[PDB]
Amino acid sequence: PVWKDADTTLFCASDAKAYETEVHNVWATHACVPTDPNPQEIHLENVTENFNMWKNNMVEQMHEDIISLWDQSLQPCVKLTGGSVIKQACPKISFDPIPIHYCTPAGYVILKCNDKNFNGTGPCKNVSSVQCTHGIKPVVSTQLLLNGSLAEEEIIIRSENLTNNAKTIIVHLNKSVEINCTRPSDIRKAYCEINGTKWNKVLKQVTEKLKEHFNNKTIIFQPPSGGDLEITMHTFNCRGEFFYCNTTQLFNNTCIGCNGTITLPCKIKQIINMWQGTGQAMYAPPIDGKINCVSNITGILLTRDGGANNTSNETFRPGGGDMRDNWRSELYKYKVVQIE
């Protein structure tokens, strides 16, 4: 077996159900093939391969997919794009993401890093070859990574350049923390419940691994200092509704009598700034009754403050400036190569 580094157009595979009206199933039924019924993972013995999650074309490929999934799936009452206004019908839709497998065509193969504490760049000594990645849910989110996979041993810090403060940091947790978001039966006010004990325990460990990477300086968390609501708030879609939740209680440092349930104030917003970059979208008011979603916090997006090089401290705020890193945090151990 011999291969070289290569980019190629991938196809997608799903367990999408053709009878479903849910938009991710609708999309993957007409835009993906069925899941590999006999997927074979092939260990490459005493091969060491280099990987680079920040320089990986599958990320931009998955990105183009999720954009076209959202363009076909969501129907706003009004789109505000490039100085024109298009207004269509905005019926409520069924929204619940499903895992998407990414697969190489003929003559290419996907390599998978399996070293447990791989950080995303550098050599991997435990390499396998696969035909499709594992099922990845396209969870659109800010501040927290939701419903993703877990690191298998220690918590991992991922960055293209930790000494560059403009590069987003991906925190891969080894322990999921549940975040239970409810809009009960003003109709836009909602709330997310988190186990404070669980979260403060994990974040303590996040601080200790960050301190391992910032030469034992004191690690401080802070809320985002300004921006649009999509930045200052943890946003996500629960059943077609766009939730905006204040996380200031999560990135508090004293709790690093607060060991019970954190209750995060949330609001369902009709008008949003589109993460596609294309502008302002307006949706209809939320459905009647209780809107609940229980998700797994599996990672944190952090950007570190600048100008503290002569300081005792490093101060980190939640979030990043590109949906692509959400995809990166599940595609980090994957690499396409051309078979030579």
Q: Which positions lie near ligand NAG, rule CB under 6 A?
A: 97, 114, 119, 121-123, 126, 139, 146-147, 154-155, 157, 159, 161-164, 174-176, 180, 182, 193, 195, 197-198, 205, 209, 213, 215-216, 232-233, 236, 238, 246, 248, 260-261, 292-296
> Locate tokens 């069925």: which residue?
34
- Closest distance to ligand MXJ from the beta carbon of 236 (Å): 5
Q: Binding to ligand MXJ (CB under 6 A): which residues in 274-333?
A: 274-275, 277, 279
- Closest distance to ligand MXJ from the beta carbon of 259 (Å): 29
Find the binder of ligand MXJ among 31, 67, 78, 140 (CB under 6 A). 140
| Residue 159 binds which of ligand NAG, ligand MXJ, none (CB < 5-8 A, kind-dependent) | ligand NAG
| Residue 59 binds which of ligand NAG, ligand MXJ, none (CB < 5-8 A, kind-dependent) | none
- Closest distance to ligand NAG from the beta carbon of 224 (Å): 8
Question: Nearest residue to ligand MXJ, using CB?
Answer: 273
| Residue 277 binds which of ligand NAG, ligand MXJ, none (CB < 5-8 A, kind-dependent) | ligand MXJ
| Residue 279 binds which of ligand NAG, ligand MXJ, none (CB < 5-8 A, kind-dependent) | ligand MXJ
| Residue 242 binds which of ligand MXJ, ligand NAG, none (CB < 5-8 A, kind-dependent) | ligand MXJ
- Closest distance to ligand NAG from the beta carbon of 82 (Å): 28
> Locate tokens 């076209």: which residue?
68
Round to whole Å and give the CA distance between 311 and 102. Answer: 44
Q: Based on C-alpha coordinates, what's the Rg of the chain?
A: 21
Round to whole Å and give the CA distance between 279 and 273. Answer: 6
Round to whole Å and give the CA distance between 339 and 35. Answer: 23
Using the minimum distance from each CB to ligand MXJ, give the nearer residue, 235 or 329: 235
Burial class (CB in 10 A: 0-12, 13-18, 19+), 8: middle
- Closest distance to ligand NAG from the beta carbon of 170 (Å): 10
Amino acid at the residue 114: N
Instruction: Count the site residues for ligand MXJ by CB under 6 A.
Output: 14
DSSP symbols for 27-52: HHHHHSEEPPSS---EE-TT--EEEE
- Packed helices 57-73 and 324-331: angle between N→C axes, nearest 10 degrees: 130
Pairing assessment for the beta strands 313-318 and 218-221 based on DSSP bridges:
parallel
Q: Are 328 and 298 in contact (CB under 8 A)?
A: no
Q: Binding to ligand MXJ (CB under 6 A): which residues in 224-283?
A: 230, 235-237, 242, 272-275, 277, 279
With H, G, I as helix, E, B as strand and everything else as coil, classify residue 196.
Answer: helix
Residue 149 binding ligand MXJ, by CB under 6 A: no
> Locate tokens 């599940």: which residue?
330
Using the minimum distance from each CB to ligand MXJ, give the nearer residue, 11 or 95: 95
Name the phi and psi angles at 165, rounded to 5. -80, -15
Round to whole Å and give the CA distance between 29 and 10. Answer: 16
The residues that touch ligand MXJ, with contacts defined as CB under 6 A, are 140-142, 230, 235-237, 242, 272-275, 277, 279
